[PDB]
Amino acid sequence: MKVQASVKKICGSCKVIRRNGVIRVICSAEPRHKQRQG
Amino acid sequence: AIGLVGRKCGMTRIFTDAGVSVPVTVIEVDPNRITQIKTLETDGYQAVQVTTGERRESRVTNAQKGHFAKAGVAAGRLVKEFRVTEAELEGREVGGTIGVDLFTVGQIVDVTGQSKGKGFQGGVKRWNFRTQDATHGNSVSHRVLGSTGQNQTPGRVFKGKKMAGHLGDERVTVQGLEIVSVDTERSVLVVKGAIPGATGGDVIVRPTIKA
Amino acid sequence: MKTLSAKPAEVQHDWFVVDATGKTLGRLATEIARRLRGKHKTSYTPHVDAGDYIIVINAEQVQVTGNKALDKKYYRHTEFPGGLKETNFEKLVAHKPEEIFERAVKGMLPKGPLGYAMIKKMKVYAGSEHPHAAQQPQVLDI
Amino acid sequence: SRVAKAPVTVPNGVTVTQNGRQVEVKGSKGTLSFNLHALVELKQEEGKLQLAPAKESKDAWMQAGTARAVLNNLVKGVSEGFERKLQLVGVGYKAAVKGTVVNLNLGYSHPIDYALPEGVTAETPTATEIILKSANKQLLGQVAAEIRAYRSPEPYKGKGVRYSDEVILRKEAKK
RNA sequence: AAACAAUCCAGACCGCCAGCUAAGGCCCCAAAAUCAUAGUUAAGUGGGAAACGAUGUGGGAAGGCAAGUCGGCCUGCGCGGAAGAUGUAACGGGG
RNA sequence: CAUCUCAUCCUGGGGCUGAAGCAGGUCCCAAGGGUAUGGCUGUUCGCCAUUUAAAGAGGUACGCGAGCUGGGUUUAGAACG
RNA sequence: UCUAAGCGGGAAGCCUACCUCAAGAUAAGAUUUCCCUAGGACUUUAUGUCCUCUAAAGAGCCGUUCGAGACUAGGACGUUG
Ligand SMILES: [Mg+2]
Ligand SMILES: [Mg+2]
Ligand SMILES: [Mg+2]
Ligand SMILES: [Mg+2]
Ligand SMILES: [Mg+2]
Ligand SMILES: [Mg+2]
Ligand SMILES: [Mg+2]
Ligand SMILES: [Mg+2]
Ligand SMILES: [Mg+2]
Ligand SMILES: [Mg+2]
Ligand SMILES: [Mg+2]
Ligand SMILES: [Mg+2]
Ligand SMILES: [Mg+2]
Ligand SMILES: [Zn+2]
């Protein structure tokens, strides 16, 4: 998980999510793309 | 937890067959007499009140005389309560007697007593404070406190600060001691180790709370 | 002629019971404090306690809006070097509902001997039953 | 809102009642329930459930679209249940249901056991395979996740406890 | 305006248990609307802070394709970015 | 003799890894407790020796002389460049 | 699609849990037991005053002292010891 101020898609398998007022990025292809805005 | 009230009689040793010496404290138990049973319906909680010892009738007030005569028991030297449950309040009735056979050899107990009083004591004894230089120019400051604060922030001494004052004479409980012997004909318990107080003071023995 | 003050010996406090089931906390507290001070009486005198007795029942059914049940904090300090203590609204309401009304209403009253004497006329109970059946309270629909 | 605005096919035997904000189903596998949100209406024909919004707002369509999707599963299950199957991969791992409590051996120093809840049942064809079967789909998924969480599958040799229809990432560890 | 020489209103000759207003205000502390009408916010935002990030949500002028769907601009109000030392402590408080 | 903060040194819980294992790197959560003795120099610091799970970073009049010391600096003597 | 409705797991941290204090907690709580049951006038007419009678349960002063103690407080005993 990368905790960043600027989170965004990286590949075509990145999905942008909103959980509990936190914007996240989840990727089902490779787990090194997980991002959390913080 | 139901227990016994006794008197600390002294400290001894017991050699075992393997030659090991075991330091032991002897506790004398005059069998306790049940003076009252408190229950949820009239008190709010379950307890067994107990007296032990003896008192001369010229030192028992008329109120305590009536309270002791309401049961069958004779007046003892103190009265004490034990918090219990039912399945522990099973066969206990006023005019009953609890003896040393409540315990067994190899049981773990807690013993509470009143420790010895040391009077007004300083920081070195009360809180293990360190002393200052003895001879390197030190003037009159050997067992003194040193600093007690800061400078105008916060501008006060904090609460719970460690200073000189009265030491000892409190209620102290020692957990985890073992029963070494239960002598029924002399009515004595012997436990392993040290217990708080002086010889002759009132101690309370009850099963261990940790288990 | 002149404006007369109410005599404490002529004051007559009355008894009322108010049910708190499903009610906003502060919008009830303002009414309770206004009744405790006596502002609803034409003999109101700011230096005299001409208020009324209030009984609150079902104190553990009082409500808050928004996210305050989890987010409203109650604080305390024991006056030891680090003794700040914190709790919730929802932990405190299922465990001590009397203190929530105590704080909410006492913050809305004066702060002095007469304010201490007014808060004594509020009686808060968690359940549906109170012990003051001999005083004959009225149902105040606040 | 395509999921709402559509009806579900209620076969015979299945029974639905609405005494309150509750809706309970009764078929052959068992009996279930579903509380409903305060902005949804329900109007069955005879075997055709109808979930509608009340006041027709943005939130009500979203609430009805799931009110439909979950009771569709309730009625889909009480007649024809649900089945999940887990596989154990790696030598030594083996599971065998002792009556109603599952005993797993997953490369530990102590034997693992899981006590199932009342709903789900679990059977054992061979050592390296478990099958759970139930009428509640949520509880079945929960039981599957709870058993999987013991030795979740690893990416270097694929060992562990897996779902059968589960895609496992895989790596090699050269230098 | 919590408290606050230099800000806002206003220039105290004395007395009154009379009346109208200014700045600022009208749920309680604490005087006066728990006033009326139409909207926005869900963040206690209001009641502290940037580059930048994002299918939050309301409004507007247009486009491409054939039960609609796609993504683009202009905008109202919000979200993240947001760590400090005695005690809550960045609405005076209750709320 | 202390007291607080967290931008966490150890211990506790995690995500990613160019993560086989053991051990690492990095980021997140976490302030409950703990967090060396010596040689040199007035030293704070620093270097070195030997330990430890670890030898954190800071605020408090660079905490603390109506609690102690007085080695440095910064009165009066004397000398060198 | 872990969240919008609904249902979970999860830390030396938080609340309990262990020890000690604690109803001046002025909201001053509870339980057992013990003690006090005489007459007259009288007017600022109400828990009103005045004069004889009475003096309980108990507490303290005092004494012998303590493994209790600065002084206190606290524990034991005072001839039936
Ligand atoms: Mg002594
Ligand atoms: Mg001197
Ligand atoms: Mg000396
Ligand atoms: Mg001050
Ligand atoms: Mg002013
Ligand atoms: Mg007013
Ligand atoms: Mg209105
Ligand atoms: Mg941190
Ligand atoms: Mg050194
Ligand atoms: Mg040497
Ligand atoms: Mg200094
Ligand atoms: Mg000097
Ligand atoms: Mg000179
Ligand atoms: Zn990706």
Q: Do chains C and D touch (3 or more CB pairs under 8 A)?
A: no
Q: Do domains D8-79 and D82-163 have the same CATH topology?
A: yes
Contacts of B128 (CB under 8 A, 6+ apart): none
In the chain, the amino acid numbered C121 is K
Q: Which of residues 43-62 of B have CB within 7 Å of strand F?
A: none
The answer to whether B55 and B76 have CB atoms below 8 angstroms apart is: yes
Radius of gyration (C-alpha) of chain A in whole angstroms: 9
Name the strands in the sheet holding D101-105, side by side, starting at the edge strand that comes first in the sequence.
D94-98, D101-105, D112-115
CA distances from B33 to B76, B111, D23 (A): 9, 20, 64
Cβ–Cβ contact C79 with B under 8 A? yes
Q: Give the integer Cα–Cα distance in Å for B125 and B104.
A: 39
3-state secondary structure D73-85: HHHHHHHCCEEEE
Q: Strand F: which nucleotides have any atom within 7 A of a protein Cβ?
A: 1-5, 14-20, 27-29, 32, 60-61, 63-65, 67-70
Sequence spans of domains, chain D: 8-79, 82-163
Q: Which of residues 73-132 of B have CB within 7 Å of strand F?
A: 123, 127, 129-130, 132
Q: What angle do CA D73, D78, D83 make, to 5 degrees?
A: 75
Q: Give the integer Cα–Cα distance in Å for D76 and D82.
A: 9
In 3D, which of B166, B157, B159 has the Cα closest to residue B127? Answer: B166
* D68 backbone dihedrals φ, ψ, rounded to 5°: -70, -45
Q: Give the integer Cα–Cα distance in Å for C75 and D76.
A: 52
* B89 backbone dihedrals φ, ψ, rounded to 5°: -90, 30
Contacts of C19 (CB under 8 A, 6+ apart): C56, C57, C58, C139
The answer to whether B190 and B24 have CB atoms below 8 angstroms apart is: yes
Biggest CA-to-CA distance, chain C: 60
Q: Name the nucleotide nearest A7; use CA and C1'.
A: E53
Q: Which long-range contacts (CB under 8 A, 24 or more apart) does D113-118 make?
A: D114/D146, D114/D147, D116/D143, D117/D143
Experiment used for this model: cryo-EM
The answer to whether B30 and B41 have CB atoms below 8 angstroms apart is: no
CB of residue B148 closer than 7 A to nucleic acid strand F? yes
Residues in chain B: 211
Residue of B148, B153, B158 to mutate, interface with C, max C Cβ within 10 Å:
B158
CA distances from D43 to B65, D17, D35, D48, D52 (A): 81, 11, 16, 8, 8
**Resolution stated for this PDB structure, in Å:** 2.7
Instruction: Measure CA to C1' and name the residue nearest G30.
Output: B43
Structure tokens at C29: 């507290």
* D173 backbone dihedrals φ, ψ, rounded to 5°: -120, 45
Ligand 2 center to B146 CA (angstroms): 17
B158 with C79: Cβ contact below 8 A: no
Structure tokens at C142: 């606040």
What ranges in chain C are assigned the alpha helix state H?
25-37, 68-71, 89-93, 97-106, 113-118
- Return the SS3 of B53: coil
Q: Give the integer Cα–Cα distance in Å for D90 and D49.
A: 47
Q: In this structure, what is the dihedral angle of CA atoms B66, B70, B73, B75, given to the nearest 10 degrees?
A: -10
Structure tokens at D53: 């919004």
* H or E element in which residue D62 lies: helix D58-79
Q: Give the integer Cα–Cα distance in Å for B1 and B112.
A: 13
Cβ–Cβ contact B159 with C under 8 A? yes
Tell me which CATH code domain D8-79 carries.
Answer: 3.90.930.12
Identify the closest residue of chain B to C83 by CA–CA distance.
B159
Of the candidate CATH numbers 3.10.50.40, 2.40.30.10, 3.40.190.80, 3.90.930.12, the domain formed by D82-163 belongs to 3.90.930.12
Residue of B148, B150, B157, B159 to mutate, interface with C, max C Cβ within 10 Å:
B159
**B88 CA from E44 C1′ (Å):** 54
Q: Strand G: which nucleotides have any atom within 7 A of a protein Cβ?
A: 1-8, 15, 18-21, 27, 30-35, 57-59, 67-70, 76-81
- Return the SS3 of C71: helix
DSSP B64-96: HHHHHHHSSPPP-SEEEEEE--TTTSSS--TT-
Per CB-CB distance under 8 Å, the chain C contacts of B159 are: 79-81
Contacts of B192 (CB under 8 A, 6+ apart): B22, B23, B24, B25, B177, B178, B180
The answer to whether B15 and B185 have CB atoms below 8 angstroms apart is: no
Q: Give the integer Cα–Cα distance in Å for A1 and B165.
A: 56
Per CB-CB distance under 8 Å, the chain C contacts of B160 are: 80-81
**HSE-up of residue D94 (Cα within 13 Å, Cβ side):** 7
CA distances from C111 to C74, C85, C117, C118, D31 (A): 20, 24, 10, 10, 61
Residue C122: Cβ-neighbour burial (10 angstroms; 0-12, 13-18, 19+): buried
- Cis check for the bond before B154: say yes or no (omega within 30 of 0): yes
Name the strands in the sheet holding D160-163, side by side, starting at the edge strand that comes first in the sequence.
D121-123, D130-134, D82-89, D160-163
C-alpha distance from C126 to closest chain B C-alpha (Å): 20
- Residue whose pair of structure tokens reads 């004594």 in the numeric block: C120
Query: Which ligand has an atom closest to residue B169 CA?
Result: 1
Q: Give the integer Cα–Cα distance in Å for D108 and D111.
A: 7
Identify the closest residue of chain B to C80 by CA–CA distance.
B159
Cβ–Cβ contact B154 with C under 8 A? no
CA distances from B208 to B32, B63, B189, B204, C131 (A): 20, 35, 16, 12, 42
**C65 CA from E42 C1′ (Å):** 11
Sequence spans of domains, chain C: 1-142
Q: Is A33 annotated as contributing to ligand binding?
A: yes
- Return the SS3 of B120: strand
In the chain, the amino acid numbered C115 is G
Residue B161: Cβ-neighbour burial (10 angstroms; 0-12, 13-18, 19+): exposed
Question: Across the strands, what pairs with B51?
Answer: B33, B79
- Return the SS3 of B123: helix
Other beta carbons within 10 angstroms of residue A28's beta carbon come to 11
Q: Strand E: which nucleotides have any atom within 7 A of a protein Cβ?
A: 17, 27-31, 34, 42-44, 51-58, 67, 79-82, 86-88, 93-95
- Residue whose pair of structure tokens reads 């507290």 in the numeric block: C29
Exposure b/e, C23-54, CB count within 10 A at least 16 = b: bebeebbebbbebbbbeeeeeebeebbbbbbb
Q: Give the integer Cα–Cα distance in Å for C13 and C19.
A: 20
Biggest CA-to-CA distance, chain A: 25
Question: Across the strands, what pairs with B21?
Answer: B15
The answer to whether C98 and C124 have CB atoms below 8 angstroms apart is: yes
**C37 CA from E8 C1′ (Å):** 35
Ligand 11 center to B151 CA (angstroms): 9
Q: Give the integer Cα–Cα distance in Å for B49 and D52.
A: 69
The answer to whether D170 and D158 have CB atoms below 8 angstroms apart is: yes
Cβ–Cβ contact C77 with B under 8 A? no
Q: What angle do CA D87, D88, D94 make, to 5 degrees?
A: 125
Structure tokens at D55: 């006041």
Residues in chain A: 38
Structure tokens at D90: 């790696």
